[PDB]
Every structure is written in structure tokens, then in C-alpha cells.
Ligand binder design. Structure first.
Ligand SMILES: Nc1ncnc2c1ncn2[C@@H]1O[C@H](COP(=O)(O)OP(=O)(O)O)[C@@H](O)[C@H]1O
Ligand SMILES: Nc1ncnc2c1ncn2[C@@H]1O[C@H](COP(=O)(O)OP(=O)(O)O)[C@@H](O)[C@H]1O
Length: 810
């Protein structure tokens, strides 16, 4: 009588009693209940009877026959046979060890009522048909372990870091794998962009069930180098691998897949038949250049693989990747990574590690900086070590004196005990403050590592439906450790506030990241912590360090660079474009050198094109070569000397790049120029020469250009300054011998007037300094004439030539 029901069961009964009242019936009858249930939106009872084999349309009419006979008049009582339905529901509820009468308890109870059981027999439902349908609704590979990595196992064991910000590509891999043709994804990108992480991320989704049911598959990574180690036995190992994949019906990730298709033994004829018979399902990884040689060039591989590009993440996306990996390195090294460390890792790796790719190179900075911090933390503090070591000396000295009986030994022993005790008074506090801070910090680390191991074991128990083990872990072990960890994080914060030493020892901040970046690059830290904004605002100072007398040209160059870097220029353009119109010998090439060294980190990242040899009419086909230079190093200045020599074939090739942003290769490929600067020189007061230019040029190509600079002639004061900086370069070499190069006005005037020519500028200057100064200077350094620590005087002799006065005879 006094029973407990689910809300859904109570709703069924109330609905049964309202249907009873709608046929004006005196009291509620199990056929009311049965019919109400069969008619519920998305009826359970209907689905159970369909699965038990029943004829739901006859069963319902049969229930409606018993229901029609029930007596009528004109509150709601229970039929003796309803009261019996609830008795049996309640007995099922107890047999299943359930606590509330649920709607499947009513369905099973209908079958206990002989009247209701008959209707179900006449619809084909036996009692074993009905019981089975409701019980339902409630509830080794040798070569793969030698040669592959079970990548879905790593995911299930927690041994695999999170994969952040690649959910579009992972889901694209899943759609490709599900195509009828071209259903083998080939991850194509450069080293370190995360091609392997995309395979690892799919493994992760497979283990969590965020996949279609057609990809509940293991993912094995084929170790190609492991196939070759220890030797035609390559072919026999691979066949056994492919056989065992095929029957575990797994997906195979193959890194460096080109090295098994031609790049060192070739197994293309082993893989190809299997990939085509669909026997093998495969995820490749390789680089774009190698995809084009070994997968496109074979028509039958192109027909089975799909190119999936994996681009390098930007600085913004790398910071997101780092914020996601952060806890994993913190828990591993026992350190705190400040967010500014992350930001500085991504920004400095983007700007100073230009030979390597995101996110690998930034992660790599973090790891090294974390390892540095933990080395320091694990090192003995110097003050405790100095005292421990001096106390050890004293104690060995006391052992020796302990048995000497002369007065002088007794006296020295008392001095030794007094110095021992003094050290102990200074040492004991320092040692117990180190042992408790270090001990606490270690325990935070150890507990944090056990919390991860527990969470993974608990997530494993849950997927396997091991409730007892997941229950021990989630509710007893994890909370026990979380509480202890919380106590220590509180003790630590109080202990740090009471030291007030201003020291964040366990903290990897920007200083630590730059210590690494300095080391990896040899650039001192001081040069590293200017922002990109300050370097850009002083860019003019950078060039003024070597380019003399061209202050106007430098302002124009630098402003145009700043337009690009502030994002104010059109994306469908190159970074910048200048036409250097000045006298030769004044510093056109020097400015290009300066740009590559400032704008790209690499002074040699310049691509030169003489145009007199590209004056041929079909020279553009050979430009070919132009495409492959800025594909290979995309961050590059692109210098065009003798632009006069340029045919109107090549003139209109730049107008593409300049108004489009990329050149189309002679094979159809797009070679990107969005990170090149483009410079063009031409030999062709100030206010007049600019207009002699204008009388020549096609306007649509010159307005496409950012700046048109007019360089100015080296004036006699710029002439002395250029020669004074060359002598400074000579001095910088003599400083390790402590020599001083005193050059007088007579000689600087000789270098001034004889080192500079009216049309070829400062080109003569350097041969003159080698022949007229450094040659005799080299003779004097060798024969003792000028010695370390001396002044080497330079003047001009009575015949008219540079002389280096000598300080000693031969
Ligand atoms: N999206 C990402 N999220 C987290 N870690 C990533 C991501 N992409 C790459 N990584 C990590 O960066 C490093 C380089 O990636 P990896 O997959 O090995 O590159 P590739 O296979 O292209 O050479 C690895 O430590 C990898 O775990
Ligand atoms: N204004 C300048 N300041 C310092 N050195 C200069 C200057 N102009 C030219 N030079 C020096 O002259 C040398 C040759 O000059 P270069 O770049 O070939 O002349 P341009 O390209 O303008 O015809 C370079 O090594 C450079 O150091």
C-alpha cells in the first residue's frame, strides 16, 4: 500500500486514473495503466513489446477490450486487480534491489496478472520474451609490441599530455578516415608543428568515446627505425606488423612515412596492395616537400591518401598550447610557471629561434627553464655548505688534538671547540629553515604527482565499470591527498610571507626564460628584454650605427616597416617595397644588409637577383629559382640590383606579388611573399632629381611601391666619419693585444681624399686600408716593431704615403 514510486511511474498512474475517469469508470484498472503506457510519447512499454516480438496493434486492442468492459457510473478507487498490479510491481522492485517502483516494474507486473498476461501471449510475447527485453534495457600481438607504440594505451594510462587547439583537424582526420576513397589522412607539416600530437589527440578521443562507433580502434604508431635495427629481414618484420594490424583491425600512424616509400629500404609494394584492398587504414606524417616527391608523384598513392595540412601555430595559439601543458611541467619539475614566462617563451622563440617551429621550440624553452629552476632548488645552499665544511675541518682537528697533552694543544683544542659551537649557533637555524621549506615543497610535488596518477587510474576504473576501485579512489584517496596538499599550500604561503626575502625560488618567470634564450643564441640578456615596440621605435638608431649620412633614407625605410608591423598595411601585399634611387657607393646595399639583420634575425637571409642576366625574354621561367628561394627561407629581403636591366616580363611579375601577396610557381604552387621585403636599386637639389625619375617610369608599377628614396652624396663631414668608423674596426681587433692606433690628421685626410671616389663612393676605402695601413702594420706586429700595450703611431711620410711609425728596431 504505502510504497514509493519514481516521478515517471507516478505520472503513469495518475494518467491511468485520468483515462479511467474519461470513460467514466468507477475505479482504476490495470488495462488503463497498460494502455496509457503504450500511448506515451516514445513509449518504453511499446519499445519493449516490439523488441520482445509482439504485435503492438493487437496487444493494444486487446488491452482496450478488457478496459471497455469495466463498470461505469455517473473519488477514484483502485480495483482489487490494480492493488494486485502494485503488489507485483513492488515485488519486482525488491527482487531487482531497487528502491523506487519504476515503469519497468509496472511492465513486468502486467505479466503477472493472468488477465494481462493473456493479451500479451496473443500478441506473441512469452514471459521469457518479456523478461529478457526488460533486463536488457536496464543494463596478445607479438610484432606490434616489438615495433609499434600502442598510442591508445598511452592515452588510457594518462601518460600523454593534453592536445590543445587542434579539434578542427582531429575531426577532419575522422571524416577522412570515413570516406569511401582518399580515406587515409597524410598529416603534412614541418618538424615540431604537432603532427604526432594530432595522432595522439585522436587516440585520446577514441579512449573517451568522442568518436563515431566506426573508430573504436586501437591506434599504433609504427617505429620505422625499429624495423631496420638488426639485419632482406626488413620486409619480413613489416609483413608481420601489417598482418597483426589487419586483424586487430587497427589504425596505423606512420611518422616519416616517406622513408618507407622511397627515402633506408623501400616497402611501397608491401603497403600499396593492402591500402588499396582497404585492409589497412593509415595516418601518415611527412613534410610538404617530401609529400610532393613521394606521395603525389605516384598516382596510386594520391588516390588513397588525403593531404591534411598542419600549419605552425601562431604566437597567440602557442601561448594557449603552453597554458594547457603548464600544469604537466609544473607537476613534473615541482615548480610554478608564471604566465609571463609562458608569454615570453612564445614571443622569444618566435623571434630568436628562427630555424625551428612552434610549439616544439617554446615547450623546449619551458622544459629547460623548469629544469634549471629545479637544479637550483635541489642544490645545497651555499651558506649551509660553507659552515658544514668548516665545522668538519674543525672536528677532524679536534679529534687529533683530543689526546695531545702539551699546554699548546689543550689551548688550541679549546679554540676549536669555541669555533665549532659558534658555527653550530649560526648553522642550526639556517638548516632547519631549509629542511622545512624544502621538505614542504617536495611534498607538494610528490602529492601533486600522486593526484594525477590517481585521477587517471580512476578514469580507467570508470571506463571499465570497476565501481569499487573508482569509488576507493574518487571519494577516499583523492580527497585525502587534496586536503593534505591544501594544508601545505597554506603553510607555504604563510612561511613565505614571514621570510619576506623578496625571492621566488621555485618560480619560472621571464628572467629564467631569457637565461635560456641567451644561452641558445649567445645574445646577451640585456639585448633580449627590449620589447618589439622599443626595438621598432629605435630602429633608426640601429641603422645609424653603420649607415652614415643617410638619415632621410632611414626615416623613410623605418616608417614603412612600422606601417607593416602595426597591422595598418593590406595583408594582400608584401611587408614593404622600396625603390632606392641614389648614387652608388652611398649605402644602398648596406641598408639591405641592415634590414635582414634587424627584421629577420639573420644578416645573411638576403636573396640577390642580378637583373642583367634575367634580361632574357624567357628569363621568367628560370624565375623556377625565384620561387624556391622564398619558399626555403620565407623570412627574407629580396634585392633587385640593376633594376634598369629588368625586362617588362619581370617588371610585371612583381606587380603580382605586390598587389596579390604571393607568386605562382611554374608548376602551379603558391610561394608565399607575405613576409618578404622587396628592394630595387637604380642609378637613374634633391627636389630636382626626384622628378628626373618621374620622367621615365610606368605609373602603375611605381605607385604599387611604398617608398621611393633619393640618397644624398657623402659630404666631406660624412667622409671623415666613415673613415673614423673603419679605423674603429681596426682598433677593435688590436684591443686583445692592448695596442692603440693613433692616426693623425695627415693620414685621415689621405684616407679621406684617396679612399673616396666621386661615382663609386666608399668602395675603395677598404683596399686602401689593407694596402696602405694594415700591410705594414702586420709587418710590425710580427718583427717586434709594435708590441702589445703600445701606441702604434700612424702618419704620412715626406713622399706622400701612409706610414706606421715603428717603436723598435729589427
Ligand atoms: N596542439 C598541441 N598541444 C599540445 N602539445 C602539442 C601540440 N602540438 C604539438 N605539441 C607538442 O609539441 C611537441 C612537438 O610536436 P610533435 O607532435 O612531436 O611534432 P611533429 O610530429 O610534427 O614533429 C611535442 O612535445 C608535442 O607533444
Ligand atoms: N654611408 C656609408 N656608411 C658606411 N659605410 C658605407 C657607406 N656607404 C658605403 N659603405 C661601405 O662601402 C662598402 C661598399 O658599398 P656598397 O654597399 O657596395 O655601395 P652601393 O650598394 O650603394 O653601390 C660596404 O662594405 C659599406 O660598408
Amino acid at each position: 500500500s504505502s510504497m514509493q514510486f519514481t516521478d515517471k511511474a507516478t505520472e503513469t498512474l495518475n494518467a491511468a486514473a485520468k483515462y479511467a475517469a474519461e470513460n467514466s469508470h468507477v475505479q482504476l484498472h490495470p488495462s488503463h495503466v497498460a494502455v496509457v503506457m503504450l500511448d506515451e510519447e516514445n513509449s518504453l512499454f511499446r519499445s519493449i513489446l516490439e523488441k520482445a516480438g509482439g504485435d503492438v496493434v493487437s496487444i493494444e486492442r486487446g488491452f482496450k477490450k478488457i478496459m471497455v468492459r469495466q463498470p461505469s457510473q455517473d473519488e477514484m478507487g483502485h480495483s482489487p486487480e490494480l492493488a494486485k498490479l502494485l503488489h507485483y510491481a513492488h515485488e519486482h522492485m525488491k527482487k531487482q534491489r531497487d528502491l523506487y517502483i519504476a515503469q519497468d516494474h509496472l511492465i513486468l507486473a502486467l505479466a503477472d496478472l493472468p488477465s494481462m498476461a493473456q493479451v500479451l501471449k496473443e500478441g506473441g510475447v512469452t514471459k521469457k520474451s518479456l523478461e529478457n527485453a526488460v533486463t536488457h534495457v536496464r543494463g596478445a600481438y607479438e610484432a606490434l609490441s616489438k615495433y609499434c607504440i600502442d598510442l591508445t594505451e598511452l592515452a588510457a594510462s594518462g601518460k600523454l599530455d593534453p592536445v590543445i587547439g587542434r579539434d578542427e583537424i582531429i575531426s577532419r582526420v575522422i571524416r577522412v578516415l570515413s570516406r569511401r576513397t582518399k580515406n587515409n589522412p597524410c598529416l603534412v607539416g614541418e618538424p615540431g608543428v604537432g603532427k604526432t600530437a594530432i595522432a595522439e589527440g585522436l587516440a585520446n578521443r577514441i579512449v573517451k568515446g568522442d568518436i563515431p562507433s566506426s573508430l573504436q580502434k586501437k591506434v599504433y604508431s609504427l617505429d620505422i627505425g625499429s624495423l631496420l635495427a638488426g639485419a632482406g629481414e626488413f620486409e619480413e618484420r613489416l609483413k608481420a606488423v601489417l598482418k597483426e594490424l589487419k586483424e586487430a583491425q587497427a589504425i596505423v600512424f606512420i611518422d616519416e612515412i616517406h622513408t618507407v616509400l622511397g627515402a633506408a629500404i623501400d616497402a611501397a609494394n608491401l603497403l600499396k596492395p593492402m591500402l588499396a584492398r582497404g585492409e589497412l587504414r593509415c595516418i601518415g606524417a611527412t613534410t610538404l616537400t617530401e609529400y610532393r616527391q613521394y606521395v603525389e608523384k605516384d598516382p596510386a598513392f594520391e588516390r588513397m591518401f588525403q593531404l591534411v595540412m598542419v600549419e605552425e601555430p601562431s604566437v597567440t595559439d602557442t601561448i594557449s598550447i603552453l597554458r594547457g601543458l603548464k600544469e604537466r611541467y609544473e607537476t613534473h619539475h615541482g615548480v610554478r610557471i608564471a604566465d609571463a614566462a609562458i608569454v615570453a617563451a612564445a614571443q622569444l622563440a618566435a623571434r630568436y629561434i628562427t630555424q625551428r617551429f612552434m610549439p616544439d621550440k617554446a615547450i623546449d624553452l619551458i622544459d629547460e627553464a623548469c629544469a634549471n629552476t629545479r637544479v637550483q632548488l635541489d642544490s645545497q645552499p651555499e651558506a649551509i655548505d660553507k659552515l658544514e665544511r668548516r665545522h668538519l675541518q674543525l672536528e677532524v682537528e679536534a679529534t687529533a688534538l683530543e689526546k695531545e697533552k702539551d699546554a699548546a694543544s689543550k689551548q688550541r683544542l679549546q679554540e676549536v671547540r669555541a669555533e665549532m659551537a659558534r658555527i653550530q649557533e649560526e648553522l642550526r637555524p639556517l638548516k632547519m629553515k631549509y629542511e622545512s621549506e624544502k621538505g614542504r615543497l617536495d611534498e607538494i610535488r610528490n602529492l601533486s604527482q600522486r593526484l594525477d596518477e590517481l585521477k587517471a587510474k580512476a578514469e580507467d576504473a570508470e571506463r571499465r565499470y570497476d565501481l569499487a576501485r573508482a569509488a576507493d579512489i574518487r571519494y577516499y584517496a583523492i580527497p585525502d591527498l587534496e586536503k593534505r596538499l591544501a594544508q601545505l599550500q597554506a603553510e607555504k604561503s604563510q612561511a613565505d610571507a614571514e621570510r619576506a626575502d623578496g625571492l621566488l625560488a621555485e618560480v619560472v618567470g621571464p628572467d629564467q626564460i631569457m637565461e635560456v634564450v641567451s644561452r641558445w643564441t649567445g645574445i646577451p640578456v640585456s639585448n633580449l628584454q627590449r620589447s618589439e615596440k622599443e626595438k621598432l621605435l629605435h630602429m633608426e638608431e640601429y641603422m645609424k650605427q653603420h649607415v652614415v649620412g643617410q638619415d632621410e633614407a632611414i626615416k623613410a625605410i623605418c616608417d614603412a616597416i612600422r606601417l607593416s608591423r602595426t597591422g595598418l598595411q593590406n595583408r594582400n601585399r608584401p611587408l614593404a617595397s622600396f625603390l632606392f634611387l641614389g648614387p652608388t657607393g652611398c649605402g644602398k646595399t648596406l641598408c639591405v644588409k641592415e634590414l635582414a639583420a634587424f627584421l629577420f634575425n639573420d644578416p645573411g637571409a638576403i636573396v640577390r637577383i642580378d637583373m642583367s642576366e634575367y634580361m632574357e625574354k624567357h628569363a621568367v621561367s628560370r624565375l623556377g629559382q625565384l620561387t624556391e628561394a622564398v619558399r626555403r627561407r620565407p623570412y627574407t629581403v629580396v634585392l633587385f640590383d640593376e633594376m634598369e636591366k629588368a625586362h617588362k616580363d619581370v617588371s610585371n611579375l612583381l606587380l603580382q606579388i605586390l598587389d596579390d601577396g604571393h607568386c605562382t610557381d611554374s608548376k602551379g604552387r603558391r610561394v608565399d611573399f607575405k613576409n618578404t621585403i622587396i628592394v630595387m636599386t637604380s642609378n637613374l637639389t634633391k627636389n630636382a632629381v626626384l622628378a628626373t625619375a618621374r620622367r621615365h617610369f610606368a605609373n602603375e608599377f611605381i605607385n604599387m611601391i611604398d617608398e621611393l628614396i633619393v640618397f644624398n652624396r657623402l659630404t666631406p663631414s660624412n667622409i671623415r666619419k666613415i673613415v673614423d668608423v673603419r679605423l674603429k674596426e681596426v682598433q677593435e681587433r688590436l684591443d686583445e693585444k692592448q695596442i692603440t692606433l693613433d692616426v693623425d690628421d695627415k693620414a685621415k685626410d689621405l684616407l679621406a681624399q684617396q679612399g673616396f671616389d666621386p661615382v663609386y663612393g666608399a668602395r675603395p676605402l677598404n683596399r686602401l686600408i689593407q694596402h696602405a695601413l694594415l700591410t705594414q702594420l702586420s709587418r710590425l706586429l710580427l718583427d717586434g716593431g709594435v708590441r702589445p700595450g703600445e701606441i702604434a703611431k700612424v702618419t704620412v711620410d715626406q713622399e706622400g704615403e701612409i706610414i706606421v711609425i715603428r717603436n723598435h728596431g729589427i
